[PDB]
Write a protein that binds this ligand. Sequence first.
Ligand SMILES: N#Cc1cc2c(Oc3ccccc3OCCn3ccc(=O)[nH]c3=O)cccn2c1
Ligand SMILES: [Mg+2]
Lengths: 547, 405
Amino acid sequence: PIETVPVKLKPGMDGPKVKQWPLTEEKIKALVEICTEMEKEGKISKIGPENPYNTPVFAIKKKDSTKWRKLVDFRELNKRTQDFWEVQLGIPHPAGLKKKKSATVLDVGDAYFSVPLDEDFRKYTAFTIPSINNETPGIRYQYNVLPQGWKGSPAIFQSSMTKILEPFAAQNPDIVICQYMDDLYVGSDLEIGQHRTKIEELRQHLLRWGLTTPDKKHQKEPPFLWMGYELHPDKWTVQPIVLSWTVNDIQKLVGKLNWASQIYPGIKVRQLSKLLRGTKALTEVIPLTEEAELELAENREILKEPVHGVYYDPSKDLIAEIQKQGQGQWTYQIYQEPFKNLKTGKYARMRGAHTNDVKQLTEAVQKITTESIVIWGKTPKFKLPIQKETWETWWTEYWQATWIPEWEFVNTPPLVKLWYQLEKEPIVGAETFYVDGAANRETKLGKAGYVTNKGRQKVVPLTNTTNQKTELQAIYLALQDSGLEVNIVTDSQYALGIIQAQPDKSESELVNQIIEQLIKKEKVYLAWVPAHKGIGGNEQVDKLVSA
Amino acid sequence: IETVPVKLKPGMDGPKVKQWPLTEEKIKALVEICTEMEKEGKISKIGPENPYNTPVFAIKKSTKWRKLVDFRELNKRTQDFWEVQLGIPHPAGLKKKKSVTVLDVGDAYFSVPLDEDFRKYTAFTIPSINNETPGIRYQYNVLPQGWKGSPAIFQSSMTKILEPFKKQNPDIVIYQYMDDLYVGSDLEIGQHRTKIEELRQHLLRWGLTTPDGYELHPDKWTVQPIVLPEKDSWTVNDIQKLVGKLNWASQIYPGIKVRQLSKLLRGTKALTEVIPLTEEAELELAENREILKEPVHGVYYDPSKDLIAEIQKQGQGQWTYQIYQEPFKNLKTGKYARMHTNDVKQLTEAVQKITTESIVIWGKTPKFKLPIQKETWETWWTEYWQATWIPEWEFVNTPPLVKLW
Ligand SMILES: N#Cc1cc2c(Oc3ccccc3OCCn3ccc(=O)[nH]c3=O)cccn2c1
Ligand SMILES: [Mg+2]
């Protein structure tokens, strides 16, 4: 026998009560045949009228195609059934598998029907078979085993399988057993004779618990078509990916591209993803963009070359190497031997504006690090296109705590660098610009300008600008009209922040103009002063622009 | 043998928190520890009808590994109800003592059994690498070590065990925060250390094991006062910053004047230009210096409210922090020096030091505002953590412009 998991319904809910819909008498007889057979094997049992609960029963009428099946909708029973410990959504990644001498797949047949259901819960699974004539009362059964649509069957099957496997795993620890839904993947490094011996021991051990294994026909074909992958005994890859597209045709294309990026390096989806903005109607078409169409042409070229990944060797280091490909886009490879990759991937910028290539690189290292721990259980060593001097300068002066594991520079351009550095101290003999901006919230127009120690002044009128755009534009004017060495004084806490963060690029066009002016300057010092305190030229520029 | 019945706060379900991924060394450690705990009856295997889960990690304070459960969510749902029913008083004398040593009393809880209707809420999962196997699932049969309910239930027996020692040493102050014993004396350090070993022997004789962060000196602790620079010549820039810092201090200290000093900067001057200080502004500067010299007053700890901690990274391994319940009313401020070593390691040491001080001073832990990207902190904070507790934290991605300590 197999121990039952005590199951309960939600606190304020009761067993389902749904009347079965009328069904064609051809199907009804087929349902009678299936349920009488299941009654024979102990899986279901006929219920008396004392049971009030009912759940809808459907069917597919028997045919040569796999249309001879009993279906039951437990959606209302599922809504009334307790929550369980969710079976893991993460799927084992092939690049984390360790090559074994042999590896057999054993799928369990009638897996849910081999595990008993809690007797106290059985009543709620009650189903009534339809009556051929409306005058006939229907015949009713309830499940004694785990129903195929029920909310609890996957998790109760998994836990039952774990308990059955525990002694055999203890008895034979050299053998590695992986569990996936209804399947057991068993690998070992024993000699081929002993490996097929222990499989039969395992195959026989599950039968004593009522679990049937594909002993005669093991699907032993070393290339396994599993969850979109090809698992060869020497390697793994992705299953072949098929290369005018409507909006939904784009989405499935991007999905197939991302799925390809596990092992095919240099797959790009950024242009298509920008196309898939809003436009929630799948029927509506997307306009073809030459740059996006180019993105597909490059991907088709990559997909032409067959790529394979290697399995994992616990005795060697994991290396992760990152390339900045394009703006905001990053690509990385993970390998142990110099040209054989374990797998591949990409990383793209976060949604926020005003980012730095160094910030993005550090985040990408962060992403890869978590991925490695999930797949392999350790962190990799890194190869990064950033000088140690660039990183050390960045970390020492960066307001946040940052870290990267051990890493070695790799002289592969594009190299990650800091496009400019602000001066810590004021510059002697450099003109001092006191800037300010202001704007009307009711009328989107505004003004911006500066006043300097040498008596220079400027005001420019602005349209459709917020107060923050003006404060940022006022700094822009001062950079444009300044020499190579300039001191700028602003009261804008907002503008100080954007520039202090030393962003490499931005979404806002004004900030990009500021960065490009900063790159052209030899020395820039930015200083902050409290607004409205009668300080310096801050009060003078305040009147010059808000008047 | 009797188990104190434990209830959750009404309208609250048990914790459902995801297990963060672990390294293979950490997983292997956890299976060793949990196998032996399972043999000892402390924990037992659970089925899928148990939907709750609480994170678990492995730290190493001790070459041997030690398990750490993150009961923060269970505490937010149990302890607050459990703190009113069975509270622990906090002595204001602990902060006064010359030396405080911190002992791990976590093994004490493993003798007292937990109410069976509560055990399911203590579920935790040992994760798997690459999802090759399902997570190993356990729940507690005895009082859990990180649970804020555990010291509350054991408090009665704790007072009995310590009574002989407290009779023999009425001067020593003993405070229990979850899993730890804070033992403060004003003796000589060598005498203090000797009394600690006597206390350890006492607990051992009564069946409480202690392992074989500590040696704190609360009376040496002092606040970080606001200090204005003292220069012989001031650039315009120097005065602007002084006015900005003095403008900043106006929120914490009433009475700060920036009138005369702001008058020095009148007009559109160059930053490098030295400014001779007027006699009136020299008076305004010195007036603000004396105001900043005398400690702040009028901030009272409110046990109903939450303590919050902010931390700023300065250079050279220096870190500053402020503890407050209200935005501009700081109960404490400090600065740490870190003997560069990892920023993350420096930050996790700072968080542990601040929490320890906040336990001694108030018997409460602060909620930290950590200046670090969440994912970086979540991956590596465990690598340096040495404490039996875990504070509450959020993340700030916005740099504080002031950096005025
Ligand atoms: N259908 C299918 C299928 C097989 C597997 C699987 O097989 C292994 C089982 C235990 C140990 C190592 C294994 O594989 C190691 C790598 N490997 C995989 C296949 C092969 O032929 N040889 C080989 O070394 C693991 C995970 C998912 N799976 C899906
Ligand atoms: Mg203004």
